[PDB]
Design a protein around this ligand. Structure first.
Ligand SMILES: Nc1nc2c(ncn2[C@@H]2O[C@H](COP(=O)(O)OP(=O)(O)OP(=O)(O)O)[C@@H](O)[C@H]2O)c(=O)[nH]1
Ligand SMILES: [Mg+2]
Lengths: 48, 428
Protein backbone atom coordinates (compact mmCIF):
# COMPACT_ATOMS: atom_id res chain seq x y z
CA UNK A 1 0.00 0.00 0.00
CA UNK A 2 1.10 3.59 -0.69
CA UNK A 3 1.44 6.49 1.74
CA UNK A 4 -0.22 9.80 0.87
CA UNK A 5 1.69 13.02 1.63
CA UNK A 6 0.49 15.24 4.47
CA UNK A 7 -0.99 18.56 3.37
CA UNK A 8 -1.85 20.46 6.51
CA UNK A 9 -1.55 24.02 7.81
CA UNK A 10 -3.16 25.21 11.02
CA UNK A 11 -5.12 28.46 10.87
CA UNK A 12 -2.84 30.37 13.26
CA UNK A 13 0.12 29.68 10.98
CA UNK A 14 -1.89 30.36 7.82
CA UNK A 15 -3.06 33.86 8.66
CA UNK A 16 -0.75 34.99 11.47
CA UNK A 17 2.32 35.21 9.23
CA UNK A 18 4.95 37.86 10.15
CA UNK A 19 3.64 40.89 8.21
CA UNK A 20 5.73 43.74 6.80
CA UNK A 21 5.93 46.67 9.19
CA UNK A 22 4.30 49.97 8.16
CA UNK A 23 6.60 52.72 6.93
CA UNK A 24 6.34 55.65 9.35
CA UNK A 25 8.77 58.56 9.47
CA UNK A 26 6.70 61.67 8.69
CA UNK A 27 7.17 64.71 10.95
CA UNK A 28 4.77 67.65 10.88
CA UNK A 29 7.05 70.57 10.07
CA UNK A 30 5.53 73.84 11.30
CA UNK A 31 6.62 77.32 10.31
CA UNK A 32 6.66 80.34 12.61
CA UNK A 33 5.12 83.63 11.48
CA UNK A 34 7.78 86.36 11.72
CA UNK A 35 7.19 88.85 14.50
CA UNK A 36 5.80 92.13 13.25
CA UNK A 37 7.74 95.36 13.88
CA UNK A 38 6.43 97.34 16.83
CA UNK A 39 4.66 100.40 15.42
CA UNK A 40 3.32 101.99 18.61
CA UNK A 41 4.15 105.33 20.24
CA UNK A 42 3.26 107.00 23.51
CA UNK A 43 1.01 110.05 23.33
CA UNK A 44 3.30 112.03 25.64
CA UNK A 45 6.20 111.37 23.27
CA UNK A 46 3.98 111.93 20.22
CA UNK A 47 2.92 115.52 20.87
CA UNK A 48 5.12 116.72 23.75
CA UNK B 1 3.27 55.75 33.28
CA UNK B 2 -0.12 54.85 31.82
CA UNK B 3 -0.50 51.12 31.44
CA UNK B 4 -3.08 48.37 30.83
CA UNK B 5 -2.73 44.63 31.50
CA UNK B 6 -4.68 42.39 29.12
CA UNK B 7 -5.91 39.03 30.43
CA UNK B 8 -7.10 36.73 27.64
CA UNK B 9 -8.97 33.72 29.05
CA UNK B 10 -10.32 30.76 27.09
CA UNK B 11 -10.05 29.58 23.51
CA UNK B 12 -11.87 32.66 22.24
CA UNK B 13 -9.98 34.93 24.63
CA UNK B 14 -6.63 33.66 23.36
CA UNK B 15 -7.64 33.76 19.69
CA UNK B 16 -8.95 37.33 19.96
CA UNK B 17 -5.75 38.20 21.80
CA UNK B 18 -3.67 36.82 18.94
CA UNK B 19 -5.36 39.31 16.61
CA UNK B 20 -4.99 42.14 19.13
CA UNK B 21 -1.27 41.70 19.79
CA UNK B 22 -0.64 41.14 16.08
CA UNK B 23 -2.24 44.52 15.38
CA UNK B 24 -0.54 46.27 18.31
CA UNK B 25 2.92 45.08 17.28
CA UNK B 26 2.26 46.21 13.72
CA UNK B 27 1.09 49.59 15.00
CA UNK B 28 3.89 50.56 17.41
CA UNK B 29 6.60 48.95 15.27
CA UNK B 30 7.57 45.96 17.42
CA UNK B 31 8.64 43.00 15.28
CA UNK B 32 7.53 39.44 16.16
CA UNK B 33 10.84 38.95 18.03
CA UNK B 34 10.42 42.03 20.22
CA UNK B 35 12.89 44.48 18.71
CA UNK B 36 11.80 47.53 16.83
CA UNK B 37 14.12 49.01 14.16
CA UNK B 38 7.90 56.16 24.63
CA UNK B 39 4.43 55.68 23.12
CA UNK B 40 4.36 51.98 23.99
CA UNK B 41 4.21 51.59 27.79
CA UNK B 42 0.45 51.02 27.82
CA UNK B 43 0.86 47.59 26.22
CA UNK B 44 4.62 46.83 26.26
CA UNK B 45 7.53 47.02 28.67
CA UNK B 46 11.23 47.35 27.84
CA UNK B 47 13.82 44.75 28.78
CA UNK B 48 16.73 47.06 28.00
CA UNK B 49 18.28 45.85 24.73
CA UNK B 50 15.55 47.27 22.52
CA UNK B 51 13.41 44.30 23.58
CA UNK B 52 9.65 44.68 24.02
CA UNK B 53 7.45 42.01 25.60
CA UNK B 54 3.64 42.22 25.42
CA UNK B 55 1.74 42.88 28.62
CA UNK B 56 -0.68 39.96 28.44
CA UNK B 57 -1.44 36.86 30.52
CA UNK B 58 -2.95 34.06 28.45
CA UNK B 59 -5.19 31.50 30.18
CA UNK B 60 -6.62 28.15 29.12
CA UNK B 61 -7.14 24.73 30.61
CA UNK B 62 -6.55 22.97 27.31
CA UNK B 63 -2.94 23.09 26.14
CA UNK B 64 -4.00 22.88 22.47
CA UNK B 65 -4.86 26.50 21.65
CA UNK B 66 -1.98 27.98 23.67
CA UNK B 67 0.69 25.57 22.44
CA UNK B 68 -0.22 26.97 19.03
CA UNK B 69 0.91 30.45 20.09
CA UNK B 70 4.21 29.25 21.57
CA UNK B 71 5.09 27.29 18.42
CA UNK B 72 4.00 29.84 15.80
CA UNK B 73 5.72 33.05 14.75
CA UNK B 74 4.85 34.98 17.94
CA UNK B 75 6.70 32.75 20.40
CA UNK B 76 9.80 34.85 21.02
CA UNK B 77 7.53 37.88 21.39
CA UNK B 78 5.81 36.82 24.60
CA UNK B 79 7.66 35.89 27.74
CA UNK B 80 7.58 32.08 27.60
CA UNK B 81 5.47 31.51 30.72
CA UNK B 82 2.99 34.35 30.19
CA UNK B 83 1.20 31.71 28.12
CA UNK B 84 -0.25 29.86 31.10
CA UNK B 85 -1.68 26.42 30.33
CA UNK B 86 -3.27 23.50 32.13
CA UNK B 87 -3.66 19.82 31.28
CA UNK B 88 -7.37 19.12 30.71
CA UNK B 89 -10.32 21.36 29.93
CA UNK B 90 -13.45 22.16 31.94
CA UNK B 91 -15.41 20.74 28.94
CA UNK B 92 -17.96 23.57 28.52
CA UNK B 93 -18.86 23.33 32.20
CA UNK B 94 -19.02 26.36 34.49
CA UNK B 95 -18.62 24.36 37.69
CA UNK B 96 -15.66 22.52 36.15
CA UNK B 97 -13.76 25.77 35.63
CA UNK B 98 -14.70 27.21 39.02
CA UNK B 99 -15.18 24.61 41.77
CA UNK B 100 -12.68 22.02 40.47
CA UNK B 101 -9.62 21.66 38.26
CA UNK B 102 -9.20 25.33 37.37
CA UNK B 103 -8.24 26.05 40.98
CA UNK B 104 -4.55 25.19 40.43
CA UNK B 105 -4.05 27.45 37.41
CA UNK B 106 -5.45 30.44 39.31
CA UNK B 107 -2.57 30.69 41.80
CA UNK B 108 -0.04 30.74 38.96
CA UNK B 109 -1.99 33.23 36.86
CA UNK B 110 -2.33 35.64 39.78
CA UNK B 111 1.37 35.10 40.44
CA UNK B 112 2.25 36.56 37.04
CA UNK B 113 -0.50 39.20 37.11
CA UNK B 114 1.24 40.59 40.20
CA UNK B 115 4.63 40.39 38.48
CA UNK B 116 3.16 42.25 35.50
CA UNK B 117 1.57 44.95 37.67
CA UNK B 118 4.38 45.72 40.14
CA UNK B 119 6.73 46.56 37.25
CA UNK B 120 4.44 49.37 36.04
CA UNK B 121 4.08 52.79 37.66
CA UNK B 122 0.35 53.43 37.53
CA UNK B 123 -2.19 50.87 36.36
CA UNK B 124 -5.39 52.18 34.80
CA UNK B 125 -7.22 49.05 33.68
CA UNK B 126 -7.30 45.25 33.70
CA UNK B 127 -8.49 44.63 30.16
CA UNK B 128 -10.06 41.17 30.22
CA UNK B 129 -11.21 38.90 27.40
CA UNK B 130 -13.55 35.99 27.98
CA UNK B 131 -15.91 33.68 26.10
CA UNK B 132 -19.04 33.63 28.29
CA UNK B 133 -21.03 30.57 27.31
CA UNK B 134 -18.29 28.01 27.84
CA UNK B 135 -16.19 26.21 30.43
CA UNK B 136 -12.96 28.13 30.94
CA UNK B 137 -13.98 31.56 29.67
CA UNK B 138 -16.95 31.34 32.02
CA UNK B 139 -15.87 29.30 35.04
CA UNK B 140 -12.25 30.41 35.31
CA UNK B 141 -13.31 33.86 34.12
CA UNK B 142 -15.75 34.16 37.01
CA UNK B 143 -13.23 33.13 39.65
CA UNK B 144 -10.54 35.37 38.17
CA UNK B 145 -12.73 38.49 38.32
CA UNK B 146 -13.69 37.74 41.93
CA UNK B 147 -10.02 37.25 42.81
CA UNK B 148 -8.91 40.42 41.01
CA UNK B 149 -11.44 42.54 42.89
CA UNK B 150 -10.43 41.35 46.37
CA UNK B 151 -6.69 41.64 45.70
CA UNK B 152 -6.78 44.76 43.51
CA UNK B 153 -9.30 47.13 45.00
CA UNK B 154 -10.85 49.75 42.73
CA UNK B 155 -8.60 49.44 39.63
CA UNK B 156 -11.32 49.29 36.98
CA UNK B 157 -11.46 45.90 35.26
CA UNK B 158 -12.55 46.14 31.64
CA UNK B 159 -14.20 43.20 29.90
CA UNK B 160 -14.99 42.22 26.32
CA UNK B 161 -17.53 39.42 26.50
CA UNK B 162 -18.16 36.90 23.74
CA UNK B 163 -21.77 36.43 24.79
CA UNK B 164 -23.55 33.71 22.77
CA UNK B 165 -25.52 34.71 19.72
CA UNK B 166 -29.30 34.81 20.33
CA UNK B 167 -30.42 32.32 17.69
CA UNK B 168 -27.28 30.26 17.05
CA UNK B 169 -24.87 29.02 19.68
CA UNK B 170 -22.77 25.88 18.79
CA UNK B 171 -23.63 24.35 22.19
CA UNK B 172 -26.60 23.35 24.30
CA UNK B 173 -25.07 24.05 27.73
CA UNK B 174 -24.47 27.61 26.54
CA UNK B 175 -27.71 28.86 28.18
CA UNK B 176 -26.34 27.50 31.46
CA UNK B 177 -22.84 28.98 31.34
CA UNK B 178 -23.97 32.50 30.41
CA UNK B 179 -26.62 32.72 33.14
CA UNK B 180 -24.06 31.36 35.61
CA UNK B 181 -21.68 34.05 34.33
CA UNK B 182 -23.98 36.90 35.39
CA UNK B 183 -22.73 36.48 38.96
CA UNK B 184 -19.32 37.71 37.78
CA UNK B 185 -19.89 40.16 34.92
CA UNK B 186 -22.45 42.12 36.98
CA UNK B 187 -20.84 42.77 40.38
CA UNK B 188 -17.12 42.32 39.62
CA UNK B 189 -16.98 43.92 36.16
CA UNK B 190 -17.31 47.63 35.46
CA UNK B 191 -16.92 47.79 31.69
CA UNK B 192 -18.92 44.75 30.63
CA UNK B 193 -18.94 45.11 26.83
CA UNK B 194 -21.34 42.82 25.00
CA UNK B 195 -20.19 41.24 21.73
CA UNK B 196 -22.12 38.52 19.90
CA UNK B 197 -20.62 36.50 17.07
CA UNK B 198 -23.73 36.67 14.88
CA UNK B 199 -23.72 40.47 14.71
CA UNK B 200 -20.10 40.61 13.54
CA UNK B 201 -20.90 37.82 11.08
CA UNK B 202 -23.55 40.11 9.59
CA UNK B 203 -21.09 43.03 9.61
CA UNK B 204 -18.60 40.94 7.61
CA UNK B 205 -21.22 39.95 5.04
CA UNK B 206 -23.02 43.27 4.58
CA UNK B 207 -19.97 45.57 4.73
CA UNK B 208 -16.89 43.57 3.78
CA UNK B 209 -18.66 41.31 1.25
CA UNK B 210 -17.29 38.17 2.92
CA UNK B 211 -20.03 35.54 2.76
CA UNK B 212 -17.85 32.95 4.56
CA UNK B 213 -15.76 34.52 7.34
CA UNK B 214 -13.64 32.50 9.75
CA UNK B 215 -13.01 33.34 13.40
CA UNK B 216 -9.77 35.12 12.51
CA UNK B 217 -11.68 37.72 10.47
CA UNK B 218 -14.07 38.03 13.41
CA UNK B 219 -11.19 38.87 15.73
CA UNK B 220 -9.64 41.38 13.33
CA UNK B 221 -12.69 43.64 13.58
CA UNK B 222 -12.67 43.37 17.38
CA UNK B 223 -8.96 44.19 17.62
CA UNK B 224 -9.40 47.45 15.70
CA UNK B 225 -12.08 48.44 18.22
CA UNK B 226 -9.82 47.88 21.22
CA UNK B 227 -6.94 49.72 19.55
CA UNK B 228 -9.22 52.72 18.96
CA UNK B 229 -10.41 52.39 22.56
CA UNK B 230 -6.82 52.73 23.83
CA UNK B 231 -5.86 55.17 21.07
CA UNK B 232 -5.75 58.27 23.29
CA UNK B 233 -3.88 56.21 25.88
CA UNK B 234 -0.94 55.60 23.52
CA UNK B 235 -1.08 58.48 21.02
CA UNK B 236 -1.78 62.19 21.30
CA UNK B 237 -5.23 63.60 20.67
CA UNK B 238 -7.31 66.76 20.73
CA UNK B 239 -9.70 65.14 23.24
CA UNK B 240 -8.25 62.23 25.21
CA UNK B 241 -10.62 59.73 26.84
CA UNK B 242 -8.73 57.45 29.21
CA UNK B 243 -10.22 54.65 31.32
CA UNK B 244 -11.16 56.93 34.23
CA UNK B 245 -13.18 59.11 31.82
CA UNK B 246 -15.00 56.02 30.56
CA UNK B 247 -16.57 55.07 33.90
CA UNK B 248 -18.02 58.52 34.46
CA UNK B 249 -19.60 59.43 31.11
CA UNK B 250 -21.07 56.06 30.13
CA UNK B 251 -22.24 54.41 33.38
CA UNK B 252 -25.10 56.09 35.30
CA UNK B 253 -25.66 53.37 37.90
CA UNK B 254 -23.18 50.77 39.22
CA UNK B 255 -25.43 47.91 38.09
CA UNK B 256 -26.25 49.25 34.60
CA UNK B 257 -22.79 49.02 33.05
CA UNK B 258 -23.35 46.98 29.88
CA UNK B 259 -22.24 48.49 26.59
CA UNK B 260 -22.51 47.80 22.87
CA UNK B 261 -19.79 48.77 20.41
CA UNK B 262 -19.89 49.57 16.69
CA UNK B 263 -16.83 50.55 14.67
CA UNK B 264 -17.91 51.89 11.32
CA UNK B 265 -15.48 52.71 8.65
CA UNK B 266 -15.58 48.96 8.21
CA UNK B 267 -15.27 49.09 4.43
CA UNK B 268 -13.80 46.61 1.95
CA UNK B 269 -10.86 47.66 -0.22
CA UNK B 270 -13.05 47.62 -3.33
CA UNK B 271 -15.78 49.82 -1.83
CA UNK B 272 -13.57 52.21 0.17
CA UNK B 273 -12.60 54.42 -2.75
CA UNK B 274 -16.15 55.01 -4.07
CA UNK B 275 -17.29 57.08 -1.09
CA UNK B 276 -15.59 59.74 0.94
CA UNK B 277 -15.51 58.37 4.47
CA UNK B 278 -16.17 61.77 5.98
CA UNK B 279 -16.93 62.37 9.64
CA UNK B 280 -20.69 62.64 9.16
CA UNK B 281 -20.75 59.59 6.86
CA UNK B 282 -18.90 57.27 9.23
CA UNK B 283 -21.00 58.22 12.25
CA UNK B 284 -24.26 57.85 10.33
CA UNK B 285 -23.12 54.30 9.59
CA UNK B 286 -22.08 53.92 13.24
CA UNK B 287 -25.62 54.52 14.51
CA UNK B 288 -27.25 52.11 12.06
CA UNK B 289 -29.18 49.34 13.85
CA UNK B 290 -27.27 46.69 11.89
CA UNK B 291 -23.57 47.51 12.49
CA UNK B 292 -24.00 47.00 16.23
CA UNK B 293 -21.73 44.18 17.39
CA UNK B 294 -24.41 42.59 19.50
CA UNK B 295 -27.68 41.39 18.01
CA UNK B 296 -29.72 44.13 19.66
CA UNK B 297 -31.64 46.75 17.71
CA UNK B 298 -31.26 50.09 19.56
CA UNK B 299 -34.50 51.47 18.09
CA UNK B 300 -36.66 49.39 20.44
CA UNK B 301 -34.70 50.76 23.40
CA UNK B 302 -33.54 54.15 24.67
CA UNK B 303 -29.98 55.48 24.65
CA UNK B 304 -28.73 56.72 28.00
CA UNK B 305 -25.07 57.43 27.18
CA UNK B 306 -22.82 57.29 24.13
CA UNK B 307 -19.01 57.41 24.01
CA UNK B 308 -17.74 58.02 20.49
CA UNK B 309 -14.05 57.71 19.63
CA UNK B 310 -13.44 59.54 16.34
CA UNK B 311 -9.88 58.67 15.31
CA UNK B 312 -7.79 60.06 12.47
CA UNK B 313 -7.74 63.45 10.72
CA UNK B 314 -11.05 64.31 12.37
CA UNK B 315 -11.63 68.04 12.89
CA UNK B 316 -13.58 68.81 16.11
CA UNK B 317 -16.18 70.93 14.27
CA UNK B 318 -17.09 67.85 12.22
CA UNK B 319 -17.46 65.79 15.39
CA UNK B 320 -19.68 68.52 16.80
CA UNK B 321 -21.89 68.97 13.73
CA UNK B 322 -22.36 65.23 13.28
CA UNK B 323 -23.46 64.87 16.90
CA UNK B 324 -25.95 67.66 16.20
CA UNK B 325 -27.22 65.74 13.15
CA UNK B 326 -27.80 62.50 15.04
CA UNK B 327 -29.45 64.45 17.87
CA UNK B 328 -31.91 65.76 15.28
CA UNK B 329 -32.57 62.19 14.10
CA UNK B 330 -35.81 60.78 15.48
CA UNK B 331 -34.99 57.09 14.95
CA UNK B 332 -32.86 57.10 18.09
CA UNK B 333 -34.44 58.08 21.41
CA UNK B 334 -32.34 59.49 24.25
CA UNK B 335 -33.75 59.07 27.73
CA UNK B 336 -35.34 62.05 29.48
CA UNK B 337 -32.67 62.20 32.20
CA UNK B 338 -29.99 62.88 29.60
CA UNK B 339 -29.90 66.26 27.80
CA UNK B 340 -26.37 65.57 26.60
CA UNK B 341 -25.33 61.99 25.96
CA UNK B 342 -22.42 62.34 23.58
CA UNK B 343 -19.01 62.02 25.23
CA UNK B 344 -16.64 62.38 22.26
CA UNK B 345 -12.95 61.68 21.82
CA UNK B 346 -10.41 62.56 19.15
CA UNK B 347 -7.03 60.93 18.46
CA UNK B 348 -4.85 62.17 15.61
CA UNK B 349 -3.22 58.83 14.75
CA UNK B 350 -5.24 57.14 11.98
CA UNK B 351 -6.30 53.48 12.22
CA UNK B 352 -3.83 51.00 10.77
CA UNK B 353 -4.44 48.07 8.43
CA UNK B 354 -2.78 44.68 8.70
CA UNK B 355 -1.14 43.70 5.38
CA UNK B 356 -3.24 40.84 4.06
CA UNK B 357 -6.15 41.54 6.39
CA UNK B 358 -9.75 42.01 5.39
CA UNK B 359 -9.96 45.79 5.94
CA UNK B 360 -8.72 48.79 3.97
CA UNK B 361 -6.73 51.94 4.63
CA UNK B 362 -9.03 54.65 5.96
CA UNK B 363 -8.27 58.21 7.05
CA UNK B 364 -11.01 58.39 9.71
CA UNK B 365 -12.61 56.16 12.32
CA UNK B 366 -15.54 56.04 14.74
CA UNK B 367 -15.76 53.65 17.69
CA UNK B 368 -19.22 54.09 19.22
CA UNK B 369 -19.66 52.47 22.64
CA UNK B 370 -23.09 53.09 24.17
CA UNK B 371 -25.39 52.05 27.01
CA UNK B 372 -29.10 51.65 26.29
CA UNK B 373 -32.34 50.13 27.53
CA UNK B 374 -32.26 47.74 24.58
CA UNK B 375 -29.73 45.24 25.98
CA UNK B 376 -32.53 43.92 28.19
CA UNK B 377 -33.77 41.84 25.26
CA UNK B 378 -30.34 40.18 25.05
CA UNK B 379 -30.49 38.86 28.62
CA UNK B 380 -34.21 38.11 28.41
CA UNK B 381 -33.57 36.06 25.27
CA UNK B 382 -31.30 33.66 27.16
CA UNK B 383 -33.82 33.83 29.99
CA UNK B 384 -36.04 31.78 27.67
CA UNK B 385 -33.05 29.57 26.84
CA UNK B 386 -32.47 28.77 30.51
CA UNK B 387 -36.03 28.05 31.66
CA UNK B 388 -36.74 25.73 28.72
CA UNK B 389 -33.80 23.59 29.88
CA UNK B 390 -33.99 23.91 33.68
CA UNK B 391 -37.75 23.18 33.71
CA UNK B 392 -36.92 19.49 34.20
CA UNK B 393 -33.28 19.53 35.31
CA UNK B 394 -31.28 19.16 32.10
CA UNK B 395 -27.48 18.76 32.37
CA UNK B 396 -27.50 19.69 36.08
CA UNK B 397 -26.38 16.27 37.34
CA UNK B 398 -23.01 16.97 35.69
CA UNK B 399 -22.74 20.38 37.28
CA UNK B 400 -23.53 19.15 40.79
CA UNK B 401 -21.28 16.15 40.12
CA UNK B 402 -18.10 18.14 40.74
CA UNK B 403 -19.37 20.29 43.59
CA UNK B 404 -21.86 22.89 42.38
CA UNK B 405 -24.60 23.44 44.94
CA UNK B 406 -28.01 22.40 43.63
CA UNK B 407 -29.63 25.80 43.69
CA UNK B 408 -26.84 27.99 42.33
CA UNK B 409 -28.79 27.88 39.07
CA UNK B 410 -31.72 29.53 40.84
CA UNK B 411 -30.11 32.69 42.20
CA UNK B 412 -28.29 33.05 38.90
CA UNK B 413 -31.81 33.28 37.49
CA UNK B 414 -32.90 35.94 39.97
CA UNK B 415 -29.63 37.73 39.26
CA UNK B 416 -30.62 37.94 35.61
CA UNK B 417 -34.18 38.77 36.68
CA UNK B 418 -32.86 41.57 38.90
CA UNK B 419 -31.13 43.28 35.98
CA UNK B 420 -34.20 42.68 33.81
CA UNK B 421 -36.23 44.76 36.25
CA UNK B 422 -33.47 47.38 36.44
CA UNK B 423 -33.28 48.07 32.70
CA UNK B 424 -37.02 48.64 32.38
CA UNK B 425 -37.15 51.12 35.27
CA UNK B 426 -34.32 53.29 33.92
CA UNK B 427 -36.38 53.92 30.80
CA UNK B 428 -39.58 55.32 32.27
N1 LIG C 1 -14.98 36.08 19.02
C1 LIG C 1 -14.64 34.80 18.93
N2 LIG C 1 -15.45 33.83 19.47
C2 LIG C 1 -15.09 32.53 19.38
C3 LIG C 1 -13.91 32.15 18.77
N3 LIG C 1 -13.82 30.81 18.83
C4 LIG C 1 -14.90 30.33 19.47
N4 LIG C 1 -15.70 31.38 19.82
C5 LIG C 1 -16.98 31.35 20.55
O1 LIG C 1 -16.79 30.78 21.82
C6 LIG C 1 -17.97 30.10 22.21
C7 LIG C 1 -17.61 28.90 23.06
O2 LIG C 1 -16.45 29.19 23.80
P1 LIG C 1 -15.06 28.45 23.47
O3 LIG C 1 -14.56 28.82 22.10
O4 LIG C 1 -15.25 26.96 23.59
O5 LIG C 1 -14.06 29.00 24.59
P2 LIG C 1 -14.44 28.90 26.15
O6 LIG C 1 -15.73 29.60 26.49
O7 LIG C 1 -13.32 29.46 26.97
O8 LIG C 1 -14.64 27.33 26.42
P3 LIG C 1 -13.41 26.30 26.38
O9 LIG C 1 -13.59 25.32 25.25
O10 LIG C 1 -13.45 25.57 27.69
O11 LIG C 1 -12.12 27.05 26.21
C8 LIG C 1 -18.64 29.66 20.93
O12 LIG C 1 -20.03 29.92 20.99
C9 LIG C 1 -18.00 30.49 19.84
O13 LIG C 1 -18.97 31.29 19.22
C10 LIG C 1 -13.09 33.13 18.23
O14 LIG C 1 -12.05 32.83 17.66
N5 LIG C 1 -13.46 34.45 18.31
MG1 LIG D 1 -11.71 24.76 25.58
Amino acid sequence: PPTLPFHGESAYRTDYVPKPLPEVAKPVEVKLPPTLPFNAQSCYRSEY
Amino acid sequence: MREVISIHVGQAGIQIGNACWELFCLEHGIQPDGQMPDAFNTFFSETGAGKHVPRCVFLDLEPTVVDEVRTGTYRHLFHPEQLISGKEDAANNFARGHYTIGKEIVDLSLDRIRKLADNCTGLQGFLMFNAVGGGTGSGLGCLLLERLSVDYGKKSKLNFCSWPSPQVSTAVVEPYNSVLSTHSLLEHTDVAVMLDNEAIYDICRRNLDIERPTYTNLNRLIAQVISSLTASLRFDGALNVDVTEFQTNLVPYPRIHFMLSSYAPIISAEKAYHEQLSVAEITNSAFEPASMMAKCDPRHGKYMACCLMYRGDVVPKDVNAAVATIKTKRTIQFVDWCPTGFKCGINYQPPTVVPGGDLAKVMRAVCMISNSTAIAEVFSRMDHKFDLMYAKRAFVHWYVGEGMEEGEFSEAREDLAALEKDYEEVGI
